[PDB]
Amino acid sequence: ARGPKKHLKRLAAPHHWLLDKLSGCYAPRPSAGPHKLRESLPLIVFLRNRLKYALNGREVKAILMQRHVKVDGKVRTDTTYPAGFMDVITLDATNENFRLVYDVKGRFAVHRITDEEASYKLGKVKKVQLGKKGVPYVVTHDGRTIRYPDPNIKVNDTVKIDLASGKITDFIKFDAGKLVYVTGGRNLGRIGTIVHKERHDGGFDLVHIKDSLDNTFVTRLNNVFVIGEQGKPYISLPKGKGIK
Amino acid sequence: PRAAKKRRPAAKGKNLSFK
Amino acid sequence: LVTPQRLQRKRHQRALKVRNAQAQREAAAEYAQLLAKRL
Amino acid sequence: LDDTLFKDEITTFLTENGSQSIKAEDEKVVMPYVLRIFFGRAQVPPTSGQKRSRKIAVISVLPNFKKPYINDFLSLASERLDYNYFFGNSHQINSSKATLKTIRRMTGFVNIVNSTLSVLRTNFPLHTNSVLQPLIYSIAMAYYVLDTESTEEVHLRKMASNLRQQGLKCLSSVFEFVGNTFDWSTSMEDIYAVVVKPRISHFSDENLQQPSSLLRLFLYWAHNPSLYQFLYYDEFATATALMDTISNQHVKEAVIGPIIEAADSIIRNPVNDDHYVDLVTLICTSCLKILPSLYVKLSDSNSISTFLNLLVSITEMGFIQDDHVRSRLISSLISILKDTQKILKIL
Amino acid sequence: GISRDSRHKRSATGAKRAQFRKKRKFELGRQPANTKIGAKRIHSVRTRGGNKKYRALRIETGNFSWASEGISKKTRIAGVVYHPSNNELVRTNTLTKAAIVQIDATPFRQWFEAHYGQTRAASAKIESSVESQFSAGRLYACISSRPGQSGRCDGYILEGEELAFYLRRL
Amino acid sequence: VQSERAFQKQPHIFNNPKVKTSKRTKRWYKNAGLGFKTPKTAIEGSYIDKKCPFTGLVSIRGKILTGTVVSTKMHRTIVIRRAYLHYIPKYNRYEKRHKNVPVHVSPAFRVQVGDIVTVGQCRPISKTVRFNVVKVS
RNA sequence: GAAACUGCGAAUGGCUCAUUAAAUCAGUUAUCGUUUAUUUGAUAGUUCCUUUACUACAUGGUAUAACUGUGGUAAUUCUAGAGCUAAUACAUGCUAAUCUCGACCCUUUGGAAGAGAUGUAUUUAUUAGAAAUGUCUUCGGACUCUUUGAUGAUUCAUAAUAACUUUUCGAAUCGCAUGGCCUUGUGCUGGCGAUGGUUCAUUCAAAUUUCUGCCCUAUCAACUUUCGAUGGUAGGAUAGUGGCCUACCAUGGUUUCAACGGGUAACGGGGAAUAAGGGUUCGAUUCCGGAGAGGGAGCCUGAGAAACGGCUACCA
Ligand SMILES: [Mg+2]
Ligand SMILES: [Mg+2]
Ligand SMILES: [Mg+2]
Ligand SMILES: [Mg+2]
Ligand SMILES: [Mg+2]
Ligand SMILES: [Mg+2]
Ligand SMILES: [Mg+2]
Ligand SMILES: [Mg+2]
Ligand SMILES: [Mg+2]
Ligand SMILES: [Mg+2]
Ligand SMILES: [Mg+2]
Ligand SMILES: [Mg+2]
Ligand SMILES: [Mg+2]
Ligand SMILES: [Mg+2]
Ligand SMILES: [Mg+2]
């Protein structure tokens, strides 16, 4: 191709969206945004194929541009806006709040949450670096840059971000015994406690995770998201609690 | 934190017969 | 043409710049206090 | 005049010994035009990097010029500043001249002199009517405006404060660079009466934190025997002022070390006049009293040594013959104990 | 016409590769900018993305740095004396990076005079050959910029082992 | 070290003639990581190399390979030979194959034809060189 | 609200399989080797600096379309002269701040005499980036010292000094609505949005790139190197690494473990058929990637094209 692609065909779309193969020929291509294309759920899919409030497209469009939908507390009007893991979708008119969290099957689940929990989110610290004028900042998994962070925050840690102000309220270090969520692979959606982090210089780091049932599984570090300490998650968990 | 309590369906089936 | 709307826009822009500067300075003071506490 | 070619033209046209430089016969006619042109460029506000660079270029071409012509550029700078009446009368400022406009014209004049001094340094041409009196008159206005003006004109007061700060900096620079070369016998009285004399009363409490331009000014006079007449004026007011900084409780080490180096120099530089004996007695007897507390404040090993270097310097000149001087010297030496061979010889 | 593609070249084994595809824009090249000493002539080049490059067709002045003194001054260019890659560039007085060039000594001399006040003494002591160059009026300098890219003739004066080496080569 | 037209130096490493603190010319060096010890000859040598892992502007990253030196006839580069067994499923049998890899070698290492060299991956040094010697044995 | 200017898109999609035998492609790596429109998140008070002889209650044609009018051609999404007029087009250009200490009073919600400091963008050079186990105290607390982060790894991030630039940016833009202060002035201040703009990160991408894996042919055994083949240094060019090209240097590189050459009704793969298992054949063709638009060659525009329902030459 001579430039960026703009079309996504249904068979080539992510499997977890659960799009009918005979409904059409194309699938909603997620626009550029906070999350990866393959790891994002466009708002059209959420409103139509999951919540069933909309039957089809321009009704999703109309819902959006009445400004009823808020992603992380901000109004969005793009049908293919790439909402992703741990995004808060608020519908004031119906009085609903949702957090995008995969189920054990590995697909985004419709998980209703309270307003108090909807007031915040968690971000995995992808990067920590000094900016211009000697200003430290942290880049999270959703592309949020937060300046002036706590010094104790390092990469692979998890920062609790307040949506209204976009500031860090608390943080969780990456250590053994922490409660952890799998965000990719075949173990995608499972929840466990850290046991060991195997380190390979110049290679991908591997982490061992033990579930509440004492079953153990190993996963790459890029697929790891701390959510709390064992027995005290900082967010409400879907049904099944990431078991099996 | 606990998940939001489930809300019962607001609307229910309504029935009518004629002719 | 010079109209009150243009004056309002210019004044608002100046106010926005000064407010941003003040907010950034307050954040810097807060972080300095935090690191003073840590050290 | 063209902005795009302005830089290349200077290095091309005005460079000394250049193939395309102006011939010696034609310098007289042409260069007055050059000085006026460069003066216009120097007046631009330095609001961007390009604007800052152009100002630097204008001041950097001055060394190419011969000394009489560099004076002409300075004379053009001071032409707008009207100072003849001030020195014509008994050093009194006129109220009408005291305005924001006049301060701004002073501020522009001082800055270029600062830039010219930085470029030419010791080669800077210092002439009376071109530079010094417009400089001395400029600082005179700053004191006059600051004292007379009410608190309402915060804007005017700030500019006077800025002009004073640059004026003192402009002074302390010229004293350092061309001070030994140029003769100040004519202007010693005017410099003291207009600049030093107004502020001697509060010199002490102002300069505790770090060296200042005017404090640096007194130190340079202290180090140089020829300029002790500044220290002699008004019953050693300035020399007493230097000491009353030291006598203060909260004086910091940064200002301490320089003064004792100056005080040590005065001891080590005998001068043949009656006032010198009075000065050294005041400088010495003053230093001895406050020395022990100063040692406690010090935090640098080098700063310890300079007190020893002053203490030894007292010994060779025989001030120790006095019963008071010897006793106070001992009180300080025991404080040091409470370099090593330097202590031993004094004992 | 100019391309940087590696497909046209023979394989490591010596096999003659066949044309995989037509020439592509992202692997392009452009004509050299043989910068020469003379009245400044620079033209911009629109490059990949929104960026721009400056082409020095002619330049007579440049900023040169006295590293030992830690100073930088703008100076006219006298001429190219020695270039390690091509003597033909020296013959044609072509300007490129690493070229050994002669520069006027007036600004550096005047700065030395203002700072040290000598035509303190220990600090004013400088290596002998560069002082001889000051006496001559021209200094040997190495261009550290790339005039065909940034449009500048900026560099640093030779010293020490560098100067001895290039003096031997001269 | 100066057997060439252009003076050969470490870029942006400046020795001050005026200060003259140490007789030795100032040298910059780095450790390439991955537990590869930097030899002292690189630290206290006299060579200059832009493509050296320890004194040049090159970083080792990616695959680390091992091979046997088979040619050292060019300047500053060698050719190693890696052997392996490819599996033919139809005949259910293995067989020997090889490939020759050209690898940059620093003068801090001394290699003859026959030793085992561990090599690290870098940016393309030349037309066919994409590796660099990092440990001789 | 026609027309036109301006902005964006037209580089997506669709079709086909010509050419291509370590090439594409599959799996698997790297960018500490580079560009990246757009999306998302952050991000820029520089007070001052003589001609203030002063536009910021807002600067020009250094200008034109659409439009009026007169015309050329057999003919085309051809256009000439003259006259007008706009910008988020083009080109210019501004308007009493904050922060360190702090004598002295005063002992706090303290006042501040005064010593000090002041954006970005490009280029180069340089620099940084590593027994206080005590005393008092109100029993708390105070007294002296600390002072960059990351990677397995860097000349990394970032900061500092000196200059440099036909050199940038730092809002002369727009919609809705008319709130608050007063010394009552068309005075001061002020709300919700859109569109722009430096840099960083993120996102959609692009380009190279690491290792392993291709049908037949030995009645193809030596091939590549004169006209770059292998490597070294320097330069040029590239968004950038690199013989990609130039100059000079050495004589190198692959191969009976099949190099090189030749054929291929050869795009590759996910897959399809058959088979008990091993195997054999097909795969242009609903999905991923690559190339092309009759055949070669070269380019404008734009973030992105060597584009062809864009342009220029040559052949049929
Ligand atoms: Mg396509
Ligand atoms: Mg890594
Ligand atoms: Mg247009
Ligand atoms: Mg073939
Ligand atoms: Mg757009
Ligand atoms: Mg016209
Ligand atoms: Mg060649
Ligand atoms: Mg074919
Ligand atoms: Mg196929
Ligand atoms: Mg194509
Ligand atoms: Mg056809
Ligand atoms: Mg476009
Ligand atoms: Mg074409
Ligand atoms: Mg067609
Ligand atoms: Mg097309």
Helices E106-116 and E128-136 cross at an angle (nearest 10°) of 120
| Residue F110 belongs to domain with CATH number | 2.40.50.1000
The tokens 């440990």 sit on which residue?
Answer: F135
Residues of D (42-71) placing their beta carbon closer than 7 angstroms to any atom of strand G are: 42-50, 52-53, 56-57, 60
What is the extent of the structural domain holding F93? 1-137
CA distance A227 to A242: 12
On the 0-12 / 13-18 / 19+ scale of CB atoms within 10 A, A28 is: buried
The tokens 């321009």 sit on which residue?
Answer: A58
Query: Does D92 contact strand G, using a CB cutoff of 7 Å?
Result: no
Distance from the alpha carbon of residue A77 to the mean position of ligand 3, in angstroms:
29
Enumerate the residues of chain F whose CB falls inside 8 A of the CB of residue E85: 5-6
Q: Which CATH class name applies to A121-171?
A: mainly beta
Distance from the alpha carbon of residue E20 to the mean position of ligand 8, in angstroms:
14
CA distance D139 to A121: 61
DSSP-assigned states of every residue in A115-176: HHHHTEEEEEEEEEEE-TTS-EEEEETTS-EEES--TT--TT-EEEEETTT--EEEEE---T
Quickly count: other Cβ atoms within 10 Å of residue A50's Cβ. Answer: 16
Query: In what helix (H) or strand (E) does residue E168 lie, and over which residues does it extend?
Result: helix E160-169
CB D144 within 8 A of CB D157: no
Distance from the alpha carbon of residue C1 to the mean position of ligand 6, in angstroms:
27
The tokens 């952890």 sit on which residue?
Answer: A180
The CATH homologous superfamily for domain A1-116 is RNA-binding S4 domain (3.10.290.10)
Closest by Cα among F55, F69, F31, F68 to F108:
F55
Enumerate the residues of chain E whose CB falls inside 8 A of the CB of residue D120: 114
Domain count along chain F: 1
Domain boundaries, chain A: 1-116, 121-171, 174-244
> What are the CA-CA distances from residue F40 to residues A147, D259, F107, F132 (Å)?
43, 52, 12, 18
HSE-CB of F31 using CA atoms within 13 angstroms: 8
CA distance A38 to A13: 8
**Tell me, which fold does domain A174-244 have in CATH?**
SH3 type barrels. (2.30.30)
Query: Does E170 contact strand G, using a CB cutoff of 7 Å?
Result: no
Q: Which ranges of chain D does DSSP label H, i.e. alpha helix?
A: 6-9, 27-42, 49-60, 67-79, 84-88, 100-120, 133-148, 154-178, 188-191, 197-199, 203-206, 213-223, 228-247, 253-268, 274-297, 301-316, 323-337, 340-346
What is chain F's length? 137
Shortest CA–C1' contact from D107: which nucleotide?
Answer: G49
Shortest CA–C1' contact from F4: which nucleotide?
Answer: G233
Which strands form A120-130's sheet, in the order they lie side by side?
A145-147, A136-140, A120-130, A158-162, A168-172
Query: In what helix (H) or strand (E) does residue E122 lie, and over which residues does it extend?
Result: helix E121-124
Which value in Å is the resolution of this experimental model?
4.2
